[PDB]
Amino acid sequence: DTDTADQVMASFKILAGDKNYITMDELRRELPPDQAEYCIARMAPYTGPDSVPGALDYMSFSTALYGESDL
């Protein structure tokens, strides 16, 4: 709404192509190794109706990043 997480999420969805999971190397190609590695580690094992190899659930990153320890 007044944030930019909802926007990033929509952009991520479009980044992967209406997929709740994105390729580890693909996001590493978009985001710098530093952020990409953190994202890869902060992501969760895809989880869905189809096991996507080399791709993990990105929604978990936004969820982990959504929860603040002082908000």
Binding site: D3, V8, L15, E30
Partner: peptide, 23 residues
């Protein structure tokens, strides 16, 4: 595009820092 999406990510991270410094 891919470049715009990444731009938004960086901007969010960027403004997030300032937001936290404020409250």
């Amino acid at each position: 595009g891919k470049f715009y999406a990444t731009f938004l990510i960086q901007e969010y991270f960027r403004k997030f820092k300032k937001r936290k410094e404020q409250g």
